[PDB]
Design an enzyme around this catalytic site. Sequence first.
Site, PDB file in Angstrom:
ATOM      1  N   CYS A   1      24.175   6.043  21.233  1.00 20.85           N
ATOM      2  CA  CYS A   1      23.129   5.290  20.547  1.00 20.85           C
ATOM      3  C   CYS A   1      22.922   5.788  19.133  1.00 20.85           C
ATOM      4  O   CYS A   1      22.701   6.980  18.885  1.00 20.85           O
ATOM      5  CB  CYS A   1      21.853   5.508  21.343  1.00 20.85           C
ATOM      6  SG  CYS A   1      20.390   4.780  20.588  1.00 20.85           S
TER       7      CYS A   1
ATOM      8  N   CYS B   1      13.419   3.365  27.034  1.00 21.83           N
ATOM      9  CA  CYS B   1      13.507   2.996  25.651  1.00 21.83           C
ATOM     10  C   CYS B   1      12.231   2.234  25.253  1.00 21.83           C
ATOM     11  O   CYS B   1      12.212   1.034  24.994  1.00 21.83           O
ATOM     12  CB  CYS B   1      14.756   2.159  25.363  1.00 21.83           C
ATOM     13  SG  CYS B   1      15.153   2.062  23.593  1.00 21.83           S
TER      14      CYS B   1
ATOM     15  N   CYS C   1      18.025   8.841  28.890  1.00 19.55           N
ATOM     16  CA  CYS C   1      18.691   7.565  28.757  1.00 19.55           C
ATOM     17  C   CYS C   1      20.204   7.666  28.900  1.00 19.55           C
ATOM     18  O   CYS C   1      20.810   8.525  28.252  1.00 19.55           O
ATOM     19  CB  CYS C   1      18.388   7.026  27.345  1.00 19.55           C
ATOM     20  SG  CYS C   1      19.106   5.367  27.069  1.00 19.55           S
TER      21      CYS C   1
ATOM     22  N   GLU D   1      10.099 -13.342  37.352  1.00 25.62           N
ATOM     23  CA  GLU D   1      10.382 -13.213  35.937  1.00 25.62           C
ATOM     24  C   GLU D   1       9.305 -13.871  35.084  1.00 25.62           C
ATOM     25  O   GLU D   1       8.900 -13.359  34.020  1.00 25.62           O
ATOM     26  CB  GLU D   1      11.782 -13.722  35.592  1.00 25.62           C
ATOM     27  CG  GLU D   1      12.878 -12.784  36.120  1.00 25.62           C
ATOM     28  CD  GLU D   1      12.843 -11.324  35.719  1.00 25.62           C
ATOM     29  OE1 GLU D   1      12.502 -11.008  34.595  1.00 25.62           O
ATOM     30  OE2 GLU D   1      13.076 -10.396  36.558  1.00 25.62           O
TER      31      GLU D   1
ATOM     32  N   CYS E   1      14.776   9.492  25.057  1.00 24.11           N
ATOM     33  CA  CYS E   1      16.219   9.435  24.899  1.00 24.11           C
ATOM     34  C   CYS E   1      16.961  10.418  25.808  1.00 24.11           C
ATOM     35  O   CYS E   1      18.094  10.149  26.257  1.00 24.11           O
ATOM     36  CB  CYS E   1      16.614   9.674  23.443  1.00 24.11           C
ATOM     37  SG  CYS E   1      15.934   8.467  22.265  1.00 24.11           S
TER      38      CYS E   1
HETATM   39  S1  SF4 Z   1      19.097   6.785  23.518  1.00 19.91           S
HETATM   40 FE1  SF4 Z   1      18.846   4.889  22.259  1.00 19.91          FE
HETATM   41  S2  SF4 Z   1      18.765   3.253  23.822  1.00 19.91           S
HETATM   42 FE2  SF4 Z   1      18.328   5.184  24.909  1.00 19.91          FE
HETATM   43  S3  SF4 Z   1      16.066   5.476  24.852  1.00 19.91           S
HETATM   44 FE3  SF4 Z   1      16.852   6.529  22.991  1.00 19.91          FE
HETATM   45  S4  SF4 Z   1      16.728   4.902  21.360  1.00 19.91           S
HETATM   46 FE4  SF4 Z   1      16.587   3.828  23.355  1.00 19.91          FE
END
Ligand code: SF4
Lengths: 225, 225
Positions: free
Chosen positions: B208, B192, B202, B37, B199
């Site tokens: 989101c 992200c 994601c 880390e 997105c």
């Molecule tokens: S959906 Fe929202 S959290 Fe996911 S990559 Fe796009 S901006 Fe980021």
Amino acid sequence: MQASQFSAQVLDWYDKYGRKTLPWQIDKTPYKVWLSEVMLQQTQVATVIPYFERFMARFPTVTDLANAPLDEVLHLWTGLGYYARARNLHKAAQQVATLHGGKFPETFEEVAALPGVGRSTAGAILSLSLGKHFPILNGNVKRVLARCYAVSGWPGKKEVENKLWSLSEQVTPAVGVERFNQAMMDLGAMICTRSKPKCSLCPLQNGCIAAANNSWALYPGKKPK
Amino acid sequence: MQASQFSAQVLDWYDKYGRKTLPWQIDKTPYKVWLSEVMLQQTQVATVIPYFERFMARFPTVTDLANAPLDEVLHLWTGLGYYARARNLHKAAQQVATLHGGKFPETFEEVAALPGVGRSTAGAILSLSLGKHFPILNGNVKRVLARCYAVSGWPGKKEVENKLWSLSEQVTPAVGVERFNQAMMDLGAMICTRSKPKCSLCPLQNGCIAAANNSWALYPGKKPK
Ligand code: SF4
Ligand code: SF4
């Protein structure tokens, strides 16, 4: 630069900068290297890792793969594309179970006789898993050698392919072959890229003809007409 | 989406797509997670891997690191940059040797009292290595949560940082915390991203706010004036 210098430079590079920690690089076996190489041939490493892990969990040995229904193999392959690879993978596993007692063969001819496995993949399997003294020649390696040595021709021409195999043979050591062959694949994947190669990061930059002439776009030749 | 759905979606994503195989993710220990880390905080994963491996080879335990001369630590760090991290790493190893018997501490206060270790790094060490139920909040995680929840403000403002810690606490489970925290870091690193987040890849895209409004550039706020 002489072939022994090429080898040494690649190995010194691999020691400080090489990829050594991927799942198919730990506790290597012929089976693991074969599986990974088949997956990697038409798919990027980041996409392959979760599939390799799922395959090894479901099929810990080549007999487990052989005995599974083909439809289950194809289901687990879903998303890797180029499913002829999966069909051959399964057939090859069945050949290993049937002809080789479930022990993945450790001799070149027997490996190269498997469906889906050519000369380069057979050499990769045995050099990476067991340190056997075979060279490799995939697309990435072709590009590194063609640039270094100004191989103008199209590797789809037999004479040109043969020239590239000769060059690969010449630079490939016996001592450290597992490391050298991985390093050549790493170089072609990450440094000597199709477009705008990162020559300043390359351990061959002091003898590569393409680097000297800024002529990487010429090598390998593309298919004519 | 409710917090329990956020968690579940992130964990389902991690199972199929997560990074699970890096060297600091195998046979995890507090020491290995801490070392990794610290290295990762200002350096990309591809650059870190060879340094982590060299450090673990040279310093298998925190007492080995503690007892080494600082100049040897700094020599091995060369190329990672941000050497205050290395100076703190060494001091922290000495604190673990001196105060904790050479056993990396497993309780939050004692971890967070180490030089170079803040609240998030302490939570990362104990959640990833031991499954202790702490949330994290590095830069990547701040961005994911600020986008999901439309946190407009600059995280350099205490009130905004506190809001982000509250959100992180809310979504962080106890069951599977090691997987969830790794997944959040993976999401912020690879999906992200600072610019043009992916997105469609994601697992949070269905709840989101930034995705719904195409407004990722607003979140987190940047520093005023
Ligand atoms: S959906 Fe929202 S959290 Fe996911 S990559 Fe796009 S901006 Fe980021
Ligand atoms: S010096 Fe440049 S063109 Fe030559 S092998 Fe290396 S990356 Fe490729």
